Every structure is written in structure tokens, then in C-alpha cells.
Amino acid sequence: NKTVVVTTILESPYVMMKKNHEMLEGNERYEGYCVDLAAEIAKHCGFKYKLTIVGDGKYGARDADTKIWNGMVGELVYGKADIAIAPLTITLVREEVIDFSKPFMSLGISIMIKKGTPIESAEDLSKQTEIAYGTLDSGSTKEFFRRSKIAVFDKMWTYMRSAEPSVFVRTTAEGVARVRKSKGKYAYLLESTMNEYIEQRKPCDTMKVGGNLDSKGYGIATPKGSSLGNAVNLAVLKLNEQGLLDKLKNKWWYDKGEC
Ligand SMILES: N=c1ccc2c(-c3ccc(C(=O)NCc4ccn(-c5cc6c(cc5C(F)(F)F)[nH]c(=O)c(=O)n6CC(=O)O)c4)cc3C(=O)O)c3ccc(N)c(S(=O)(=O)O)c3oc-2c1S(=O)(=O)O
């Protein structure tokens, strides 16, 4: 039997380098939620596996000009990996070209504030202009606002699209720094999972407020028609029912949190 090639992505806390990684080999180089999850999936499915970091560092999209899938999705579609174990969002266009398990983690768009900011909901943000707010320039959150027909989110998009200086940031680190350094006058819109992670990072000055604005899930992906997909999906369901997915989330977000 052959070693399963698992594509994954360097993204904290899902996959992170061990400090001594230069003196380590194979799967021992990495730690994180998806490292632990890969070991559990492999245990339940009965395979040996090698974690490999996706070469282009991307989740996966179809290039608008060439029509070629990149990222982990592309690794699956073009025969370079057997399974993707990563926070890969289950979307329509991806589901058409690869197979997904049921989701192992659910999430939604959410609001990050500096502690003390008088905001508790998206509606609160939308009905004022003293506190600026934005999102990742390249993110799925931006696209949610662009396409939304809900009055509150439409108003928020109209504000964000034309706000000056730009309220959009190039990276999560830029967004978080802007929240922390703006003295409560900038709020940041992002995935609840990342928001919750940052809430547990020093110096513990940010928090997540309000309910999620949408709902989506991260799934395990296999090439379309792969015989591995059935067992992997049953594994995700068993791990959820055993409490193990919740245990892993608690471990990497809270037991290992700094706040
Ligand atoms: N200098 C730079 C520097 C960075 C540039 C980036 C860039 C931006 C931001 C970040 C960053 O904050 N990462 C942390 C983060 C925040 C949210 N997630 C997340 C996203 C998922 C996902 C799971 C998660 C997680 F983790 F929450 F679970 N699962 C999916 O299934 C999925 O799909 N997504 C995407 C989505 O949901 O959105 C992760 C990292 C990068 C990067 O270096 O890869 C860049 C990206 C796209 C793009 N088209 C272009 S660009 O074309 O070049 O403009 C980009 O450019 C960049 C230039 S740049 O080129 O010089 O202008």
C-alpha cells in the first residue's frame, strides 16, 4: 500500500513549523490543528501519509485568464496530491471539481474590535461613521459584501467601497495592527475562526463582537471520484460525534491561547 500525499497550507494554528524543524524530518516538522486532524483521519482510514505544503501557498481558485486551478485544489485536480487536509472552504465552484467531506469546522464573517469600542453588531457599524471599518482587500469577506442584497450589508459595502483613506488592508496582520493602533476608531471584518484565534494572542486587546454575518464550512477534499473520499467523510463525522473536533479546536485556540 502506498503513502498518501496530503497537501496542506502553512496557516496558524492549522499547520505551523516546529521551532527545531530544520533538524526534523517528514511530518515531525509540523504541528497544529490540521496536523492533529490528519493523524486522526489516517488512524480511522488506515493509511500512512506524508504532509506536503502546497507549493504556491494558495487555497485554490480557477485562474480567470488561463482557467487553470491553483493552490491545493489544483494539486488535487491535476494529480499531485491524494487529499487536502486544511481549512479549505466548501464552495460551489470547488465542489464541481473536487470532492469534499462534510465540514470539520464551521465559521462565518464576524467583527473584530479593539476592546472598549462601542460596537456590538454590523448594524451598529452601518449606522455611524466615527468608527471606520474594513476588510481584507483580496478576501472572501469583501466579496460577500460586494454581492449582498441585505440593506445593512449593502450600506456597509457602499461605505467601504468609497471610504478614503482606503479601509481595505493587504494582509490580516495589517488589519489587526490597524485595529490595535487606531484607538477604537477602526473595526475589522473577517472570518470568525481567525478572529477567535487573534482574540487569544498577546497583547489581548482585540475581541470578536456580534453574531456571524454568514455561514460556511471548511472541509477535507479529495480528487473527484477518489475511493478515499467515503472513509474520510465517515471519519470526520465520527470525530465530530466523539467530541474530537471540538477538543482540537479548544486545544489550539484556548488551551494554547495567551489570553
Ligand atoms: N504583497 C502581498 C502579500 C500578500 C498577498 C496575499 C495575501 C493576503 C492576505 C493573507 C492573509 O491575511 N492570510 C491569513 C488569512 C486570512 C483569512 N484566511 C483564510 C482564507 C481562506 C481560507 C482559510 C483561511 C484561514 F486561515 F482563516 F483559515 N480557506 C479557503 O478555502 C479560502 O479560499 N481562503 C481565502 C478567502 O476566504 O478569502 C487566511 C495572505 C496572503 C498571501 O500571501 O497568501 C494575496 C492573496 C490573494 C491574492 N489574490 C493576492 S494578489 O492577487 O496578488 O493581490 C494576494 O496578494 C498579496 C500580496 S501582493 O500580490 O503584492 O499584492
Author numbering: 10 to 268
What does the article say, verbatim?
α-Amino-3-hydroxy-5-methyl-4-isoxazolepropionic acid (AMPA)–type glutamate receptors (AMPARs) are the most abundant ionotropic glutamate receptors. AMPARs form tetrameric cation channels that are composed of GluA1–GluA4 subunits, of which GluA2 is the most abundant. Changes in the trafficking of α-amino-3-hydroxy-5-methyl-4-isoxazolepropionic acid (AMPA)–type glutamate receptors (AMPARs) play an essential role in synaptic plasticity, which is the cellular basis of learning and memory. Herein, we report on PFQX1(AF488), a fluorescent probe for the visualization of cell-surface AMPARs without any genetic manipulation to neurons.
Therefore, we used a ligand-binding core moiety of the GluA2 LBD, termed S1S2J, for the x-ray crystal structural analysis. The structure of S1S2J bound to PFQX1(AF488) was determined at 1.82 Å. In the structure, PFQX1(AF488) was recognized over a large area of the aperture of S1S2J. Specifically, the aromatic group of PFQX was stacked with Tyr68 (Tyr450 in full-length GluA2). The two carbonyl groups of PFQX, which mimic the α-carboxyl group of glutamate, formed hydrogen bonds with Arg103 (Arg485) and Thr98 (Thr480). In contrast to the PFQX part, the AF488 fluorophore part of PFQX1(AF488) was located at the vestibule of the binding cleft of S1S2J. In addition, the phenyl group of AF488 was situated at the hydrophobic region surrounded by Leu145 (Leu650) and Thr180 (Thr685). The main-chain amide group and the side chain of Thr181 (Thr686) formed a hydrogen bond with the carbonyl group of the amide group of the AF488 part. Of note, the negatively charged sulfonate group of AF488 interacted with the side chain of Arg179 (Arg684). Therefore, the x-ray structural analysis clearly revealed the molecular basis for the increased affinity of PFQX1(AF488) bearing an anionic fluorophore for AMPARs.
